[PDB]
Amino acid sequence: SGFRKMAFPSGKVEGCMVQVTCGTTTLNGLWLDDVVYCPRHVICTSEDMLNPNYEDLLIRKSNHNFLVQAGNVQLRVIGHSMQNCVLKLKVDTANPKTPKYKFVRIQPGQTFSVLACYNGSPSGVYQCAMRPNFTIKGSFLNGSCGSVGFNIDYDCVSFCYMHHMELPTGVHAGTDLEGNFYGPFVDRQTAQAAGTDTTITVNVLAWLYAAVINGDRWFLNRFTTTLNDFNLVAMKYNYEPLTQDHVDILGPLSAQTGIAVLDMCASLKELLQNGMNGRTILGSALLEDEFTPFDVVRQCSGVT
Amino acid sequence: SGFRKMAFPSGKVEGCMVQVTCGTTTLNGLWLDDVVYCPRHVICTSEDMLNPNYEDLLIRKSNHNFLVQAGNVQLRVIGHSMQNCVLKLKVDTANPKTPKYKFVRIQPGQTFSVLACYNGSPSGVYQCAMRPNFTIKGSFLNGSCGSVGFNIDYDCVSFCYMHHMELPTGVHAGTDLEGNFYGPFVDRQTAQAAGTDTTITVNVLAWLYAAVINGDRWFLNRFTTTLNDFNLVAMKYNYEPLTQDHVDILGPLSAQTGIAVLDMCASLKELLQNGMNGRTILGSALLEDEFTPFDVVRQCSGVT
Numbered sequence: 135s136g137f138r139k140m141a142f143p144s145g146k147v148e149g150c151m152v153q154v155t156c157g158t159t160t161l162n163g164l165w166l167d168d169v170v171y172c173p174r175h176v177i178c179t180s181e182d183m184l185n186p187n188y189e190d191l192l193i194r195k196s197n198h199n200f201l202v203q204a205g206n207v208q209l210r211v212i213g214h215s216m217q218n219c220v221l222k223l224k225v226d227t228a229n230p231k232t233p234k235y236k237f238v239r240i241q242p243g244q245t246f247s248v249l250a251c252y253n254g255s256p257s258g259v260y261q262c263a264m265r266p267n268f269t270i271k272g273s274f275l276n277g278s279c280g281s282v283g284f285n286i287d288y289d290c291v292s293f294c295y296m297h298h299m300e301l302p303t304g305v306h307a308g309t310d311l312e313g314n315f316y317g318p319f320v321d322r323q324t325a326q327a328a329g330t331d332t333t334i335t336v337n338v339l340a341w342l343y344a345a346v347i348n349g350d351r352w353f354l355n356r357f358t359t360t361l362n363d364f365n366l367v368a369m370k371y372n373y374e375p376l377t378q379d380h381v382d383i384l385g386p387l388s389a390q391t392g393i394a395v396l397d398m399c400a401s402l403k404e405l406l407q408n409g410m411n412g413r414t415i416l417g418s419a420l421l422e423d424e425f426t427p428f429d430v431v432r433q434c435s436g437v438t
Numbered sequence: 439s440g441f442r443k444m445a446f447p448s449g450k451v452e453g454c455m456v457q458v459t460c461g462t463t464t465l466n467g468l469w470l471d472d473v474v475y476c477p478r479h480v481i482c483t484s485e486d487m488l489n490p491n492y493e494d495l496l497i498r499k500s501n502h503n504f505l506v507q508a509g510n511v512q513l514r515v516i517g518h519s520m521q522n523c524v525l526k527l528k529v530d531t532a533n534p535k536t537p538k539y540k541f542v543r544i545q546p547g548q549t550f551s552v553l554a555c556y557n558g559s560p561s562g563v564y565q566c567a568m569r570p571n572f573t574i575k576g577s578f579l580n581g582s583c584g585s586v587g588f589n590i591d592y593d594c595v596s597f598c599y600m601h602h603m604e605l606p607t608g609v610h611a612g613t614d615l616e617g618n619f620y621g622p623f624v625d626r627q628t629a630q631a632a633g634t635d636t637t638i639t640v641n642v643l644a645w646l647y648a649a650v651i652n653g654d655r656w657f658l659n660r661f662t663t664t665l666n667d668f669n670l671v672a673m674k675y676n677y678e679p680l681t682q683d684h685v686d687i688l689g690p691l692s693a694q695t696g697i698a699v700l701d702m703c704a705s706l707k708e709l710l711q712n713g714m715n716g717r718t719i720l721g722s723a724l725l726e727d728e729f730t731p732f733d734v735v736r737q738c739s740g741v742t
């Protein structure tokens with residue numbers, strides 16, 4: 135019993151973190167096989183970041199200008215290429231600690247673990263969600279760029295995020311491991327405003343199921359609703375519209391608890407209209423939306 | 439910028455987890471040098487747990503009755519001893535992945551990371567606090583016993599917790615790595631009620647400083663207070679009394695922000711008396727108490 139915001143064990147990713155320095159800029163890289171992946175803005179001065187031409191800046195860089203350090207050992211750079219917003223540095227040594235891995239581009243509302251790093255050294259691990267506006271709400275100081283987000287399926291690490299930017303509003307933007315930004319963001323120090331940070335409805339419903347499984351039941355009510363009726367309420371409260379795909383995904387949690395998905399929607403509708411009245415659910419005074427239905431099943435079933 | 443509930447990177451502890459089986463009971467053990475540490479209730483049937491005589495049960499066990507598996511390799515048990523509520527199994531092989539480590543007994547209000555494990559396999563990592571009633575609020579299913587709590591100082595793991603029990607109220611109890619329970623709890627399936635779960639005042643104050651550093655400032659007010667006046671309010675709201683030792687510990691955060699500790703106490707006093715009025719601080723609708731002053735400094739300074 136109990137339900138916690140839980141990250142994946144980080145060891146498999148710790149084994150992949152290195153320091154990348156280009157001139158006076160240091161950040162983190164990800165070493166998988168004989169390639170190190172890092173943000174292309176490693177090549178920028180803070181002055182360059184205001185208006186960078188990355189192809190033109192990169193022409194002034196050679197393999198020997200990229201200093202890659204794995205613990206206290208230097209790696210030899212034998213090639214470099216830019217793919218979208220990431221640099222790929224080819225090194226002469228395969229990472230001996232390379233785990234089984236994939237690169238995946240996640241959808242908004244999907245959760246992942248971040249291993250925050252500075253100078254190639256892990257400092258902490260926490261759980262994030264890709265927000266519906268394609269920002270994340272992380273914890274990143276200067277030097278954290280190139281820290282990665284990931285999920286683990288048994289022994290296979292799926293890398294989904296690399297940290298690139300902090301927006302003027304103090305939320306975070308980055309890329310998949312192909313170097314494509316999530317959302318409309320660019321690796322330039324310019325005005326970039328975020329869209330509406332809507333609540334991830336299917337994740338709130340998952341977390342209410344987690345609450346029932348763990349004995350927090352006060353919010354269960356005598357009502358039901360329809361997807362259309364629920365969605366009028368979601369729209370009013372800046373919640374993502376609920377689709378039949380989301381209802382299907384919540385099927386296992388419905389079956390386990392015996393609470394029909396549309397009944398839990400009616401409980402959520404009442405919570406939106408009435409508030410928490412100073413009560414808590416799983417130690418929260420607000421409706422938590424950074425657990426996916428898969429997260430709730432995993433944590434409630436003890437998957438390793 | 440941003441502030442997250444952050445766990446320590448778990449790799450150094452993942453390298454220490456093993457499976458311990460005695461008869462039909464399987465749980466987790468911690469392998470450090472040539473010793474495996476696990477809960478002594480590994481020797482109990484569920485029937486035994488109602489009223490166990492551990493010395494008498496242990497007489498019926500030999501070294502060969504303790505099956506220790508490290509990944510898919512069996513370790514040879516060459517001795518066993520009971521120390522308080524933990525078994526120490528001496529094996530013939532030192533763990534090659536043994537990190538620098540210490541055993542520490544933490545004080546209530548101190549935070550630590552838990553690596554939740556099943557069958558010796560890590561499933562997740564999250565951040566806990568030793569509550570003032572000597573419970574923790576974890577996420578532990580059947581098979582999680584012997585999962586450990588720890589802090590890391592650079593390269594040295596300080597182990598502070600091993601999981602033993604779930605109370606009938608669904609909160610958690612365990613031991614330090616000398617096998618001494620935190621609080622009054624025992625490794626028996628009997629009525630054990632928890633005392634008041636008071637709020638860890640010094641940690642709330644730390645988190646309000648974290649909020650100011652990260653730009654959440656709406657709760658700062660025009661008032662100050664005294665320790666005695668603040669403490670009358672703390673008592674009313676089931677908060678731990680604030681001591682001059684706590685004021686001293688918050689000194690660096692006071693200095694960084696320029697907000698005198700007693701001024702932040704007066705902001706906290708108003709929040710207790712007035713509530714949040716539907717507002718949030720660092721994405722929370724309640725006052726968070728599972729960050730220590732050291733946690734806030736570490737996360738805000740990027741210590742690796």
Ligand SMILES: Nc1ccc(S(=O)(=O)Nc2ccccn2)cc1
Binds near residue numbers: 327
């Ligand atoms: N929000 C935002 C998005 C893209 C860019 S740009 O660096 O592509 N530069 C551009 C884009 C359009 C017009 C002029 N410069 C800058 C800001």
Ligand SMILES: Nc1ccc(S(=O)(=O)Nc2ccccn2)cc1
Binds near residue numbers: 622623624628
């Ligand atoms: N809450 C609590 C604490 C200790 C015990 S005991 O297993 O030590 N057994 C005892 C203790 C006192 C009287 C009888 N049995 C049981 C319950």
